[PDB]
Write a protein that binds this ligand. Structure first.
Ligand SMILES: Cc1cccc(C)c1-n1c(=O)c2cc(C(=O)C3=C(O)CCCC3=O)ccc2n(C)c1=O
Ligand SMILES: Cc1cccc(C)c1-n1c(=O)c2cc(C(=O)C3=C(O)CCCC3=O)ccc2n(C)c1=O
Ligand SMILES: [Co+2]
Ligand SMILES: [Co+2]
Lengths: 380, 380
């Protein structure tokens, strides 16, 4: 059941912004590791004396990396005269965020019809304001409300139907056309100490509905009207055999924040071949693969969806498979993206639910908790 | 003339430590960009609850990348019970350094016969102490004094004749044997507001001597007895046509600090081929190449050292050539390593001065200031 109760018109995920100590090194590492092209910049070379921001793209996926310059460079500016291209940016906020949490996601940005209306309606319905609507070059409006922890939900609306005003398209020489098949953000997942209050807050100001659904967590998924914006949230379950990875997250992150980004691939086998080639030469590492029994047991579970060759290729790449009543999910998880055992990435591809493909087809892999534990003891 | 006035026995450069916001992403970027292998680690997986430190090596070159964890992880520790593998590390110091300067070099480490003696003699001769000698596992002694700005000169001495106690050798699977030919640190260069006082201070506590020698700078080089540890220092020259790059450094760095690391290659043509292949896929960019007139004029200057083919290969890779009375220098400079126009890297190879090769053979490229300006107007 989908009551379609969005309190304002939401379109799709627009971008994810990481707050960094050095945006250049994180952006270059991510570009190589994920196969994303350098698409736009806002920095000293574009007149921005406040922050360095670099945009990577792969298909419709947009990753922004931002770091502060010395405040001395902009000490004469005031907000009316700022050279920042993202007017919500604040040196103190960014340094405090990075000191507290390490490298991680500051903003989950969604495109809406009217960011000023979305902001007003959100705050009227309980959202804690973070940055009020600001119109950039009479062309784009951006506004921010608190989502959880120090993560904001950023509203972006466009008059037209680039990236942001003040960003420039990087030079072709500096823009190598990397592409490992990643195409869009499927979902963005938060970790909180208490699920109930978090859900009530976010669903309260968005009108997002709950998407139709002992391993250390309880979870729920909030979804927009067409279920294309998907925001799962996890809480820990205490007193378990193995320590909850949600609680480890909260400890090392200094509280709530974004846990993982799930990136849809048009060909998860190519994406994983390309990412695994680069794991030890600057890219990303993946979690340890499941035992071979897990892949033996895939025949009974998804033998009607994947061939034996396609199953065998899942086995060499360490890909996980889950299935609901509507579709099938291929997924795999990276090791944490930086120093702390906090944020990681999920690569996914969904099969089924053809109408375009409806959102969340195949679920989120919750069935892989039981299948992994089963396969663990089976191969033992 | 070399008075050989070292006040304690100095051997060679040992390592360079970068202070980072996220050590993982900087280390992975540098590994791919420079062709250095992951060699050792000290982090949560080795019991270090204080800092994450990753060591990259290429030949004898050692780059260490360190970032702080949340202080909450080690809140119960005191210095006698610390899990830090580098006992000089301090969360506040590291966050303050990175907030002030951005990504950059905290420590220039040299190996000495006795780090405790070097520390005592240095401080007796004017060195400002930074971290007193500490013996690690009865095997290694480390001590630190201020060099310039917030950069320290780190003394390391070994009883035996790994890396540091508490570091572990990374797994083979995570240790890809990258190698683009870089073999050791040739020199490490500081930028200061006033050269005179800086030289007097450092030469005062080390006994290092001045090495035998309008473009925006004055410089001088301090050298150990065998001239294998080389520490040039630059000051700006104000009121020039083009703004001094030393003054730009000081402004964006918030004062004095390390300007560049010069890395000796055993084959600069292979190193630059490999680095330039990777510039736009996560590696390092190089400064704009000199005009073709510069390479036309190489025939008259170094036609007795480099063939026409070897000169032509300098031209395609953008390599610079200078010559003193003793040897010839091939060199090239990267663009800044991170967000700020501060630290960069020089790749060099020296030809001549065979005895082993004596230190500083061919100089530091000061002749390339005049040759570049000459070539600029010539090709105009
Ligand atoms: C990757 C890893 C590292 C260390 C410990 C553990 C438990 C894991 N880990 C996961 O985090 C994980 C996450 C999801 C997942 O994506 C997800 C959602 O997107 C929203 C609903 C809740 C949920 O589970 C699915 C399966 C998972 N599995 C199977 C897994 O093992
Ligand atoms: C790389 C760059 C970017 C923007 C502006 C400029 C001036 C430069 N730049 C250099 O920084 C540069 C540095 C050295 C050098 O290594 C060096 C030493 O190691 C110690 C003695 C002083 C000295 O000059 C030599 C030649 C150089 N040249 C030729 C050059 O153009
Ligand atoms: Co997921
Ligand atoms: Co140099």
């Amino acid at each position: 059941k989908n009551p379609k109760s969005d309190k304002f018109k939401v379109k799709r995920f627009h971008h994810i912004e990481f707050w960094c100590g050095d945006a250049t090194n994180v952006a270059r590492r991510f570009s190589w590791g994920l196969g994303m092209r350098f698409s736009a910049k806002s920095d000293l070379s574009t007149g921005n004396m406040v922050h360095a921001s670099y945009l990577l793209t792969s298909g419709d996926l947009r990753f922004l990396f931002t770091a502060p310059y010395s405040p001395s460079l902009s000490a004469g500016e005031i907000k009316p005269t700022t050279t920042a291209s993202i007017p919500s940016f604040d040196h103190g906020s960014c340094r405090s965020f990075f000191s507290s949490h390490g490298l991680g996601v500051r903003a989950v940005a969604i495109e809406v019809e009217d960011a000023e209306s979305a902001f007003s309606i959100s705050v009227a319905n309980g959202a804690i304001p973070s940055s009020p609507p600001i119109v950039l070059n009479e062309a784009v409006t951006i506004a921010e409300v608190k989502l959880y922890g120090d993560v904001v939900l950023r509203y972006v609306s466009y008059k037209a139907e680039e990236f942001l005003p003040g960003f420039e398209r990087v030079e072709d020489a500096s823009s190598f056309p990397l592409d490992y098949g990643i195409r869009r953000l499927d979902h963005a997942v938060g970790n909180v100490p208490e699920l109930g209050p978090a859900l009530t807050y976010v669903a309260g100001f968005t009108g997002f509905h709950q998407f139709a659904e002992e391993s250390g967590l309880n979870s729920a998924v909030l979804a927009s009207n067409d279920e294309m914006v998907l925001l799962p949230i996890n809480e820990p379950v205490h007193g378990t055999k193995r320590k909850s990875q949600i609680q480890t997250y909260l400890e090392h992150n200094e509280g709530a924040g974004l846990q993982h980004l799930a990136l849809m691939s048009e060909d998860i086998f190519r994406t994983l071949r390309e990412m695994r080639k680069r794991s030890s030469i600057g890219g990303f590492d993946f979690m340890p693969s499941p035992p071979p029994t897990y892949y033996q047991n895939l025949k009974k579970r998804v033998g009607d969806v994947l061939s034996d060759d396609q199953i065998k290729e899942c086995e060499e790449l360490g890909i996980l498979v889950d299935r609901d009543d509507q579709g099938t999910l291929l997924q795999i998880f990276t090791k944490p993206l930086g120093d702390r055992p906090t944020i990681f990435i999920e690569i996914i591809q969904r099969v089924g639910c053809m109408m375009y493909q409806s959102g969340g087809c195949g679920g989120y892999g919750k069935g892989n908790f039981s299948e992994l534990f089963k396969s663990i003891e089976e191969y033992e």
